[PDB]
Design a protein that fits this description.
Helices cover about 35% and strands about 15% of the residues. The chain is of the alpha/beta class. Strand 12, helix 9 and strand 13 (about 305) form a beta-alpha-beta unit. It is classed as transferase.
Length: about 350
C-alpha cells in the first residue's frame, strides 16, 4: 500500500477503464492487499460506475465555467483527500491530473511519488505540457515515451509498460490453399479522419489476387464507406457486420479463417484490437502511426508496418501475403507478443513503479 489512481472523469465503458480496474484488483491481491484507491475530477456525474464495482473512489466537482477556477477547486479538493488518505504513490491516468497531483502535493504537505500513465498520444490530446509535473512516467507505447522525452524528460525516468491482453487457447487459422485471402477490419468506421477506411479500400482495390474483406463495426460514415466500395467496384468482396458486442466470437463462429487484420489509421490511442488479433494468431498489417503498432508488429514475423501515407507500400504488403511470398505462421504469432500478456505485463508494470521508489 498505498496507491492512488487519479484522473478526469471518463465514460465508464472504455478499454482504459478495463485495464485500470484489472490492474487495481491484481494489485489488491498481490501482497496481503497493497491498497488502491481512485479519485476523479468531474464536471458532472455522467460516468458509469459499474467498472468501479469493488473499487474505493472519491470525486471532485466543480462545473464553474472559467477553467482557472475549476482547476483551483480540483486542486483544493484533491489536497484535502491527500490529507485523509495518505498515499505513497499517485498515478495519473491523464496529463491534466499530473498538474493537479503536483499542485495538491505542495498544498497538502504530504509526501508521495507521482507517476504519469497517459492512455493517448500527447500530441493528439490537450494539456500535453502538464506531463512534466509528474516525477516518473509509465508509457504504454514507445511513441508516448518519445513524446515525453521531447518535453525534456530523461529516458531513465520513463518506463515503457505497454498494455495487457489475455492469453488465448485457440488459434484462428489462415484460409486453406486455393481459397481467397480473407482480410479483417475491426473498429469504428471513419472514412477519412482518424481511421482512414478510405485508405483501406484504396489499397485493397489496387491489390493483385482474390480477396474478401470482413468489416466489424460501424459509425456515421457507414453509408459513405459503402458508396466508396461501390465506386471502387469492390462491393461484392466486402461483408459488413455492423456493430458487434463480441467481435472475436463473430470471427471464430462466422469467418473462421483469416489471412490478416488490417489497420490504416492516421493515429491511435492504443490499438488494442491488433493485440487481440495477434493473441489469436492473426497477422496484422498496420500503418506505422502514433502510437502502438510498431511496438507490437515485427515485420515479416507477425505482420507488417507501412509509413503513414505510403499506400503503395501497403499494397505491396497485401500482395505478398495474398501470394504466399511472405507467410506468417499463425501457430507461433501469439508467442510474439509475450510482454503484453496479463501476468508478465503486471510484473513489469509493478517493477516500473517500485524500481523508481
Amino acid at each position: 500500500m498505498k496507491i492512488a489512481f487519479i484522473g478526469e472523469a471518463v465514460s465508464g465503458f472504455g478499454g482504459m477503464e478495463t485495464v485500470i480496474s484489472n490492474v487495481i484488483h491484481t494489485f489488491e491481491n498481490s501482497s496481503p492487499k497493497i491498497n488502491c484507491e481512485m479519485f476523479f475530477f468531474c464536471r458532472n456525474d455522467k460516468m458509469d460506475k459499474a467498472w468501479l464495482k469493488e473499487i474505493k473512489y472519491a470525486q471532485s466537482f466543480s462545473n464553474i465555467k472559467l477553467s482557472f477556477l475549476r482547476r483551483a477547486k480540483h486542486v483544493y479538493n484533491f489536497s484535502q483527500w491527500l490529507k485523509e488518505t495518505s498515499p505513497d504513490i499517485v498515478i495519473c491516468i491523464d496529463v491534466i491530473s499530473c498538474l493537479y497531483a503536483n499542485k495538491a502535493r505542495k498544498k497538502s504537505g504530504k509526501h508521495f511519488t507521482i507517476f504519469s500513465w497517459p492512455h493517448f498520444s500527447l500530441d493528439h490530446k490537450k494539456h500535453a505540457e502538464c506531463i512534466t509535473y509528474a516525477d516518473y512516467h509509465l508509457a504504454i507505447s514507445s511513441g508516448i515515451k518519445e513524446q515525453i522525452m521531447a518535453r525534456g524528460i530523461s529516458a531513465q525516468d520513463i518506463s515503457v509498460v505497454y498494455n495487457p491482453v489475455s492469453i488465448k487457447t485457440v488459434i484462428v487459422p489462415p484460409p486453406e490453399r486455393d481459397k481467397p485471402a480473407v482480410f479483417l477490419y475491426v473498429g469504428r468506421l471513419k472514412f477519412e479522419g482518424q481511421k482512414r477506411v478510405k485508405d483501406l479500400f484504396d489499397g485493397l482495390a489496387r491489390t493483385t489476387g482474390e480477396w474478401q474483406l470482413h468489416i466489424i463495426g460501424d459509425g456515421s460514415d457507414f453509408e459513405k464507406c459503402q458508396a466508396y466500395s461501390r465506386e471502387l467496384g469492390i462491393e461484392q468482396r466486402v461483408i459488413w457486420y455492423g456493430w458487434q458486442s463480441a467481435p472475436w466470437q463473430v470471427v471464430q463462429q462466422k469467418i473462421k479463417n483469416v489471412t490478416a487484420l488490417l489497420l490504416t489509421s492516421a493515429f491511435e490511442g492504443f490499438p488494442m484490437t491488433l493485440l487481440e488479433a495477434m493473441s489469436y494468431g492473426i497477422p496484422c498489417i498496420s500503418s506505422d502511426c502514433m502510437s502502438g503498432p510498431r511496438d507490437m508488429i515485427k515485420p515479416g514475423l507477425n505482420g507488417e508496418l507501412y509509413t503513414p501515407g505510403a499506400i503503395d507500400d501497403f499494397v505491396g504488403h497485401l500482395n505478398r501475403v495474398i501470394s504466399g511470398e511472405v507467410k506468417y505462421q499463425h501457430d507461433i504469432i501469439p508467442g510474439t507478443i509475450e510482454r503484453f500478456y496479463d501476468v508478465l505485463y503486471f510484473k513489469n508494470f509493478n517493477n516500473a513503479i517500485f524500481s523508481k521508489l
